C-alpha cells in the first residue's frame, strides 16, 4: 500500500495495490501422439546398397523425423552430424528428406563433411560448405566382399572438373587423356574414369566395405512434409497450467465439458473470440479452458496514524483459490465478521462494509440503512408539532479550479 501510494503515511480507506494471479502448476504439451515416424530404420536394414559412382536418393516424406534416437546411439561403425548441434536437428522442417546412400571403403567415410576434399566428396557426392545433415555408416564385409574381389562397387576418380554441391554424374564413358580419339573403347590415352574397390574379406578394416546413409534435406515453396518429432505429456484437470494443443498455446484451468463439438472442430470460442474449449488430440474428450483466477488485491486500512492493522480483499476470488471470510465482493482476510450491522465506515461491496473497532481489530459487517420506524398511522389520527427548532445547515460547493497555462513547446522540448 505505502509503495502504491508513494507515501510513508496512509490515511483510512480501501486501496487497490496489485493483482493476484493463480500460477501455472505444470506444463501440458498435447501434440498429436507420436505416429508416422520417418522410415530411416528401414533403410538401415536394407538387404543391399548402391555403388557410390551411381548413388541413390531414397525419398522420405509425409512423416516426422527423429535424429535423437540416432545421435544417442553407438549402433553405427561411424556417425556424424553437421551445420547445427545434434540437439537442434529435432527442431528442423523440410519439404522432403533423403537417404542419399551408397557402399564405400571405411577409410573414405571421413571425406563426407561440409565442403571437404576427398575422392567421394569431389567426384561422387559433394556436401555444400555449410551442409546441415548426418552421415551414418556400418561395416558390410560379411555381404559386400567376395573371393577374388567384388568389382561391382566403384568410385569416380578422373574428371575434367570437380563436383559442385549435390552434383551427380553416373557416366561410365571413356576418359580421353591425350590427342587420341577413343571411339568408345579402352586403350592408350583412353582410360576408365572409375576405380573399382574389388572388395575381399581378407582386406584390412579401412579397405573393407561399409554401407552408408547420408541424411540429406530439401525445403522448397511446397509445404514441409517432414519435421522433427512431437513431444508428449500427461494431462490433468481443475488446476492452472501452461498448455499447448497442437500449436494452440495458453495458460488456463482445464475442465470436463459438455460442448457439442463436430468431429473436425479442434477448439471453441466465445462471442469476443475468447478460446474457451479444446479437443484433446491424444484422447478425444472436450476440455473447457477456464481462465486462471485473478483479481485486484485491495488493502483495507484504518489511518496508519492510529494502527498498522490491515485486512485484504481479493476482488472476485473464492477463498478456496487464494481470520478468513467469503463475501460477494470476493475473499476477505484479516477482518472479523460481526453480526450487528452499523453505518458504513470503509466500503467493500454488495452490502458489506468494514471498520476498526473494539483491544481493537478490523471488523466487517452488512451495513445498516437506518433506524426502523413504525409510523403510528390510522384513518383518524394526525400528529402536529407543538414547538420548533431553528436549524443552521452548512453546504459547501466548489466553484473554480486553479487556473493553469502550459507552454507545450517548453514542456515537450525544454
Amino acid at each position: 500500500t505505502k509503495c502504491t501510494l508513494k507515501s510513508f503515511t496512509v490515511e483510512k480507506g480501501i486501496y487497490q495495490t496489485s493483482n493476484f494471479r493463480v500460477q501455472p502448476t505444470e506444463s501440458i504439451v498435447r501434440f498429436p501422439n507420436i505416429t508416422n515416424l520417418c522410415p530411416f530404420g528401414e533403410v538401415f536394414n536394407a538387404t543391399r546398397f548402391a555403388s557410390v559412382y551411381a548413388w541413390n536418393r531414397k525419398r522420405i516424406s509425409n512423416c516426422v523425423a527423429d535424429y535423437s534416437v540416432l545421435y544417442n546411439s553407438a549402433s553405427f561403425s561411424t556417425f556424424k552430424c553437421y551445420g547445427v548441434s545434434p540437439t537442434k536437428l529435432n527442431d528442423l522442417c523440410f519439404t522432403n528428406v533423403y537417404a542419399d546412400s551408397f557402399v564405400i571403403r571405411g577409410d573414405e567415410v571421413r571425406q563426407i563433411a561440409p565442403g571437404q576434399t576427398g575422392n567421394i566428396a569431389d567426384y561422387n557426392y559433394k556436401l555444400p560448405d555449410d551442409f546441415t545433415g548426418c552421415v551414418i555408416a556400418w561395416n558390410s564385409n560379411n555381404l559386400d566382399s567376395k573371393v577374388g574381389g567384388n568389382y561391382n562397387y566403384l568410385y569416380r576418380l578422373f574428371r575434367k572438373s570437380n563436383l559442385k554441391p549435390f552434383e551427380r554424374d553416373i557416366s561410365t564413358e571413356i576418359y580421353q587423356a591425350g590427342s587420341t580419339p577413343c571411339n568408345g573403347v579402352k586403350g592408350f590415352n583412353c582410360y576408365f574414369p572409375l576405380q573399382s574397390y574389388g572388395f575381399q574379406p581378407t582386406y584390412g578394416v579401412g579397405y573393407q566395405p561399409y554401407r552408408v546413409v547420408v541424411l540429406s534435406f530439401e525445403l522448397l515453396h511446397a509445404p514441409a512434409t517432414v519435421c522433427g518429432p512431437k513431444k508428449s505429456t500427461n494431462l490433468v484437470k481443475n488446476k492452472c497450467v501452461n498448455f499447448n494443443f497442437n500449436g494452440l498455446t495458453g495458460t488456463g484451468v482445464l475442465t470436463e465439458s459438455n460442448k457439442k463439438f463436430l468431429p473436425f472442430q479442434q477448439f471453441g470460442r466465445d462471442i469476443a473470440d475468447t478460446t474457451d474449449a479444446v479437443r484433446d488430440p491424444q484422447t478425444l474428450e472436450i476440455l473447457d479452458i477456464t481462465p486462471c483466477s485473478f483479481g485486484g488485491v485491495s488493502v483495507i486500512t484504518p489511518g496508519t496514524n492510529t494502527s498498522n492493522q490491515v485486512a485484504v480483499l481479493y476482488q472476485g476470488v473464492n477463498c478456496t483459490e487464494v481470520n478468513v471470510f467469503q463475501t460477494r465482493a470476493g475473499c476477505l482476510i484479516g477482518a472479523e465478521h460481526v453480526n450487528n450491522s452499523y453505518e458504513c465506515d470503509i466500503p467493500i461491496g454488495a452490502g458489506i462494509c468494514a471498520s476498526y473497532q473494539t483491544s481493537q481489530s478490523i471488523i466487517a459487517y452488512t451495513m445498516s440503512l437506518g433506524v426502523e420506524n413504525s409510523v403510528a398511522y390510522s384513518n383518524n389520527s394526525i400528529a402536529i408539532p407543538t414547538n420548533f427548532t431553528i436549524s443552521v445547515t452548512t453546504e459547501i460547493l466548489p466553484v473554480s479550479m486553479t487556473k493553469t497555462s502550459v507552454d507545450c513547446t517548453m514542456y515537450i522540448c525544454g
Partner: protein, 204 residues
C-alpha cells in the same frame, strides 16, 4: 445454361466450435442467389475456387481432374471414387480427353433423391476440400433452404491450379468470390443460417 443458387454453398471457414452466436468473417464464398452453371464433359477455369454439386448415387460422376496443363507435361491432380473408396494422386497423367465407363509423381492419398455438394480451393501449397449430402424433394434446381458444407482434407500437394474437369440427372458449378458473410451458429455448434453482406442493403 444457368440456375439460381439461393442460400447454397456455405462451409465452415475454420475448424472452430461456436454456440448460439453470429460471427462475421471474410474469405472465398459462393455469393447468395448467384447464377451457377448447369450441366446434364467440358474443361472449366478454376477462378479463385469452385463449388460443385450433383444429383448422384450411381458413381457415373467418378470424380474430377484439376491442374494447369491437365496433361503429362507436368503434375496433374486426379480425384477418383471407385465405389469402395476415394483415391487422389498428383502425377503427370495422360488419360482420355473424354473418358466414359465400361458398363514424375510427388504425392498420393486415399480416403436422384440424394443431392451431393462439394467445395474446392488451393492456398499456398495446400488443397482444401469440403462436402455435404442431403435428400431433396424437388425434381431439378437446387434446394432454397440452408445447409452447411463440412471440411474433409488439407492435402499438402504443393502445386497450383488454374482449370478443372468432371470425370464421367444434373450437375451444377459455382465460383467463389472474396466476400464477408455473417454466419449463424445454433446451440449445438453448427452453422444453420447466413447473410451475404454485399447482397442487398438489408443484408448490409
Amino acid at each position: 445454361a444457368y440456375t439460381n443458387s439461393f442460400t447454397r454453398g456455405v462451409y465452415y471457414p475454420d475448424k472452430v466450435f461456436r454456440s448460439s452466436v453470429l460471427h462475421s468473417t471474410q474469405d472465398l464464398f459462393l455469393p447468395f442467389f448467384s447464377n451457377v452453371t448447369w450441366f446434364h464433359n467440358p474443361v472449366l477455369p478454376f477462378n479463385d475456387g469452385v463449388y460443385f454439386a450433383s444429383t448422384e448415387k450411381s458413381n457415373i460422376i467418378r470424380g474430377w481432374i484439376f491442374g494447369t496443363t491437365l496433361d503429362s507435361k507436368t503434375q496433374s491432380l486426379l480425384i477418383v471414387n471407385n465405389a469402395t473408396n476415394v483415391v487422389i494422386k498428383v502425377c503427370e497423367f495422360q488419360f482420355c480427353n473424354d473418358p466414359f465407363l465400361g458398363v514424375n509423381c510427388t504425392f498420393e492419398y486415399v480416403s436422384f433423391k440424394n443431392l451431393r455438394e462439394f467445395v474446392f480451393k488451393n492456398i499456398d501449397g495446400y488443397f482444401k476440400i469440403y462436402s455435404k449430402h442431403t435428400p431433396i424433394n424437388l425434381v431439378r434446381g437446387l434446394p432454397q433452404g440452408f445447409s452447411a458444407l463440412e471440411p474433409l482434407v488439407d492435402l499438402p500437394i504443393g502445386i497450383n491450379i488454374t482449370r478443372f474437369q468432371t470425370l464421367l440427372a444434373a450437375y451444377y458449378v459455382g465460383y467463389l468470390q472474396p466476400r464477408t458473410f455473417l454466419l449463424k451458429y445454433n446451440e449445438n455448434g453448427t452453422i444453420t443460417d447466413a447473410v451475404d453482406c454485399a447482397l442487398d442493403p438489408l443484408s448490409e
